[PDB]
Amino acid sequence: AMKTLEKVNYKGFIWPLAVGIVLWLITPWRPGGLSVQAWEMFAIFVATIVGCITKPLPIGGTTLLGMVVTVLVGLAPVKDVVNSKGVVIQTGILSSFGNSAAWLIAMAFIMAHGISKTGLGNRVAYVMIEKFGKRSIGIGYAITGLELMMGALIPSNSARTGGVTWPVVESISKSYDSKPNDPSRKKIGAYLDFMAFHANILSTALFITGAAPNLVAQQMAAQKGYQMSWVSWFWAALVPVLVATVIIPLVIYKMYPPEVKETPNAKNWADDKLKEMGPISKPEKIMATVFCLAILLWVLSGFFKIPQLDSAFVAFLAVTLLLITGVLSMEDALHETGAWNILIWLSILIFMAGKLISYGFIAWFAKFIQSEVHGINWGLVLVVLILLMFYTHYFFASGTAHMTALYLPFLTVATAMGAPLGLSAMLLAFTGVINASTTHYANGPASILATTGYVKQSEWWKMNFILGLIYMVIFGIVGTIWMKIIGIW
Amino acid sequence: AMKTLEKVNYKGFIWPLAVGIVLWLITPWRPGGLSVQAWEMFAIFVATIVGCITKPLPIGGTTLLGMVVTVLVGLAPVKDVVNSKGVVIQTGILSSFGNSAAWLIAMAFIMAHGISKTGLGNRVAYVMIEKFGKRSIGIGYAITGLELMMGALIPSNSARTGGVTWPVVESISKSYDSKPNDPSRKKIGAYLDFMAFHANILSTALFITGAAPNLVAQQMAAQKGYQMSWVSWFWAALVPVLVATVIIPLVIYKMYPPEVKETPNAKNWADDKLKEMGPISKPEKIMATVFCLAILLWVLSGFFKIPQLDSAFVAFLAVTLLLITGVLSMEDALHETGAWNILIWLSILIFMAGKLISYGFIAWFAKFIQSEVHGINWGLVLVVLILLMFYTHYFFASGTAHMTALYLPFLTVATAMGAPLGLSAMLLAFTGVINASTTHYANGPASILATTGYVKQSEWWKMNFILGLIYMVIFGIVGTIWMKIIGIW
Numbered sequence: 001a002m003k004t005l006e007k008v009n010y011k012g013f014i015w016p017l018a019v020g021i022v023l024w025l026i027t028p029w030r031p032g033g034l035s036v037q038a039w040e041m042f043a044i045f046v047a048t049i050v051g052c053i054t055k056p057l058p059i060g061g062t063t064l065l066g067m068v069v070t071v072l073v074g075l076a077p078v079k080d081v082v083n084s085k086g087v088v089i090q091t092g093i094l095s096s097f098g099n100s101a102a103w104l105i106a107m108a109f110i111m112a113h114g115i116s117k118t119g120l121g122n123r124v125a126y127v128m129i130e131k132f133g134k135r136s137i138g139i140g141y142a143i144t145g146l147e148l149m150m151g152a153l154i155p156s157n158s159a160r161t162g163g164v165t166w167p168v169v170e171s172i173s174k175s176y177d178s179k180p181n182d183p184s185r186k187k188i189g190a191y192l193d194f195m196a197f198h199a200n201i202l203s204t205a206l207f208i209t210g211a212a213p214n215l216v217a218q219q220m221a222a223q224k225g226y227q228m229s230w231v232s233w234f235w236a237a238l239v240p241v242l243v244a245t246v247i248i249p250l251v252i253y254k255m256y257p258p259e260v261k262e263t264p265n266a267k268n269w270a271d272d273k274l275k276e277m278g279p280i281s282k283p284e285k286i287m288a289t290v291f292c293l294a295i296l297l298w299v300l301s302g303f304f305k306i307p308q309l310d311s312a313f314v315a316f317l318a319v320t321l322l323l324i325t326g327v328l329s330m331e332d333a334l335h336e337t338g339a340w341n342i343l344i345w346l347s348i349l350i351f352m353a354g355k356l357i358s359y360g361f362i363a364w365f366a367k368f369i370q371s372e373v374h375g376i377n378w379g380l381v382l383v384v385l386i387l388l389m390f391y392t393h394y395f396f397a398s399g400t401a402h403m404t405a406l407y408l409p410f411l412t413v414a415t416a417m418g419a420p421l422g423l424s425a426m427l428l429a430f431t432g433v434i435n436a437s438t439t440h441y442a443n444g445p446a447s448i449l450a451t452t453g454y455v456k457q458s459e460w461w462k463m464n465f466i467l468g469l470i471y472m473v474i475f476g477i478v479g480t481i482w483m484k485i486i487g488i489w
Numbered sequence: 490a491m492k493t494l495e496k497v498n499y500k501g502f503i504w505p506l507a508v509g510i511v512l513w514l515i516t517p518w519r520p521g522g523l524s525v526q527a528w529e530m531f532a533i534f535v536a537t538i539v540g541c542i543t544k545p546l547p548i549g550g551t552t553l554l555g556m557v558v559t560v561l562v563g564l565a566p567v568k569d570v571v572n573s574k575g576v577v578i579q580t581g582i583l584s585s586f587g588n589s590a591a592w593l594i595a596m597a598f599i600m601a602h603g604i605s606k607t608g609l610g611n612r613v614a615y616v617m618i619e620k621f622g623k624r625s626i627g628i629g630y631a632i633t634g635l636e637l638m639m640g641a642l643i644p645s646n647s648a649r650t651g652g653v654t655w656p657v658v659e660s661i662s663k664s665y666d667s668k669p670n671d672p673s674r675k676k677i678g679a680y681l682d683f684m685a686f687h688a689n690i691l692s693t694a695l696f697i698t699g700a701a702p703n704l705v706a707q708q709m710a711a712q713k714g715y716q717m718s719w720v721s722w723f724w725a726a727l728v729p730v731l732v733a734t735v736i737i738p739l740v741i742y743k744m745y746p747p748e749v750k751e752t753p754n755a756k757n758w759a760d761d762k763l764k765e766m767g768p769i770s771k772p773e774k775i776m777a778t779v780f781c782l783a784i785l786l787w788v789l790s791g792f793f794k795i796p797q798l799d800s801a802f803v804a805f806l807a808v809t810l811l812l813i814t815g816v817l818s819m820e821d822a823l824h825e826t827g828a829w830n831i832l833i834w835l836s837i838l839i840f841m842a843g844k845l846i847s848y849g850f851i852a853w854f855a856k857f858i859q860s861e862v863h864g865i866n867w868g869l870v871l872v873v874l875i876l877l878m879f880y881t882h883y884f885f886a887s888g889t890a891h892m893t894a895l896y897l898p899f900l901t902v903a904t905a906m907g908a909p910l911g912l913s914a915m916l917l918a919f920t921g922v923i924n925a926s927t928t929h930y931a932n933g934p935a936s937i938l939a940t941t942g943y944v945k946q947s948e949w950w951k952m953n954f955i956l957g958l959i960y961m962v963i964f965g966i967v968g969t970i971w972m973k974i975i976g977i978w
Contacts, residue, residue, distance in 0.1 A: 005815030060819040061812040068806050077796040087575040098587040307566040317557050323550040326494030330549040334826035341823055
């Protein structure tokens, strides 16, 4: 029946491939202390990234192309191999889709389809504008407050943004008539998306238990002789977090205008739509009950380390409850494209970054930074280490690996050059946390918000580079003086 | 916007849960030489199966419920655990979706959507009826011939049925106006579906390289002192395979009537629709080219064991070629529900059967069958072993594990009780091959055909039980006399 093919932006392929090609040719003159495979992998990673930007063969197919290329040249087998004893050495692309962050995000997308189907979202959104609608900027503050209330409880930054904020924002945007992948986005949506991401960042920095990376930093420091605590993190990050909550949203309102800047007849609008929708129905009560149960189990996961509370299985039982209950049939979920799309591309990028951390790249970077800086005023050392960690998180995709590779070495450096361990450790932890303002594949939240459509990726990278400069300046300077204040040094 | 929930067949839950419950209560009086966990797992597996039959919460959500239950009671953690050295002991549900058969089938479904979109399928189907249409039964023979031509080349029974037959059959059925999940199926479709499955079985039995299980049997026999060869398998299975190709299709035509039994004006119809459709177009040529490339790489995979030819990565590069070419956009694939549905449920069932083979069930069955049969005429031994293997394949989901667990022991038994090794080995291999006529989760092909919709599962299990009785009788008796003929014993 069909006659013609589907349009494609072949032009984009010009940029990535070239780079990859280029880098292959540069292999023999690589920095050294390195292999040959590692540079091939670096090149293909850079190419896949440049493709994700240029948007040929949308992100899914592009990362699929990257997996294929990686498999074709002899960098990644398909099936896990063994050491003749049961160990694993060179993982395979099929051992990638068995990640946690991906399936967490996906099941959360399913929960969100259920929400936006039963109507709960439109209700809560009309409510949030009733209470904050006027001065649209307020919503920003609003939701960040929301995040600033949960971060202390929910240790999965992938959920805070996948099962709480993202649906709220989708609903609001569906209210003001701001649909994605259309010029109707700049009204209010993109602003809320961006502010929600950065609020999740602020939260994951404020409380220690906002994300695994911080737990890992605490573990490593303890391995080095410093006992982080729920309270010390808070007492150290309160000040800078307020500074950021005061700066960031304003600079965004000034840099990313929500074309709809005010609505004075809000309360009337919200109350009218409430009265017109009618009371809440059985399905909405069920879905809200399950959402509350999910929140409850997610928060329990922070106090009891039990398989039943992985912070992912909860979403699975949420989905199966929605299914067994009737609110949502499997035939619905199976056509929530965004979920499986994210699954695919996030998993593949994580696998590629894993191959990087494996083949020896990061170890070489560490040995290099260790053998380069020998005698300097340790302040410059902390500064350069902070910058390198931050602008290095690009080459990673999870954050956990980032800390477990480049936290202990950097801290050892800073303490072996004249500086104290406490300050350097807390600084590097805040850095490992605020990395997220670089890309779209850093942590789950970014993997969601910067892909749905409300935000072109160019603007994303640019704005986040700016805000990351700001975050570094603020945390470094302020947090340093405020730690020197309260008996840290 | 929505008001009411979605209909559900709660009644079905009556059967599975009960069984599960029942079996928990029977735990303390289990046969013995066994654990406690193993019986819990057996029970939950039986329950998930009974659910797949009764069709509450369609197969996807049901197996999801099974995974959830398995996780809730303390049988399967979510994240792979380690032995403090790097080994894996108790896999997790997330290490399940990293299977090969699943993603193979899924990417094949995507290829099939591309086919049925560009039109290739309608073309080839009108052609196949032009050449065989009259006497609809013929198509059966036709496609089995097709399989009987590929089995010697393609060592992935999951593809022969996922990338060659299934689309042909879908297209034909779309011709005679037989759409799934509707009383319009009994016209011609279900017959072709069933016959195609059983033809793939005949093929995988005919040539040794039709499926991994046979390779594994050859390996184990060699470990025991018998060198199977491409030619011996053929010379032994020719006769019974012809007998089956002559019996099975007829007994099916007599047991599962294709309500449309004949069409006399076929050739005219096919030529008319050809002339009306027009010549082949660029997209169809591209898709056929990629399909041929995929066939070629799949067949190469039989002679060169190379990561690039896993028999799964081929489908991945096929998909990404369809994508980069324009025949098929990622936004299309991402809404081919059947693919991800199969992914989910097949992967989960495989993981559950893996937990069974792990916790000690199968080892206990083997020790039992070994310590029970002590002194008997070895003919009865071979008979009972054949029957037990066959009707045991239920508790497995792949076939590979089935042979690697219950081939060497059974052969050792048969050779330690008066019988020869060659006959017993070849017999048990044919059994490990024809298992597939029991269920819907045995091997990939069944995982596809007996789920699309053309075939209710009740009829499937019943008919396949009958045909499995027939297969056992035929292979055992005939193949035995025909092996005793040609210098096997």
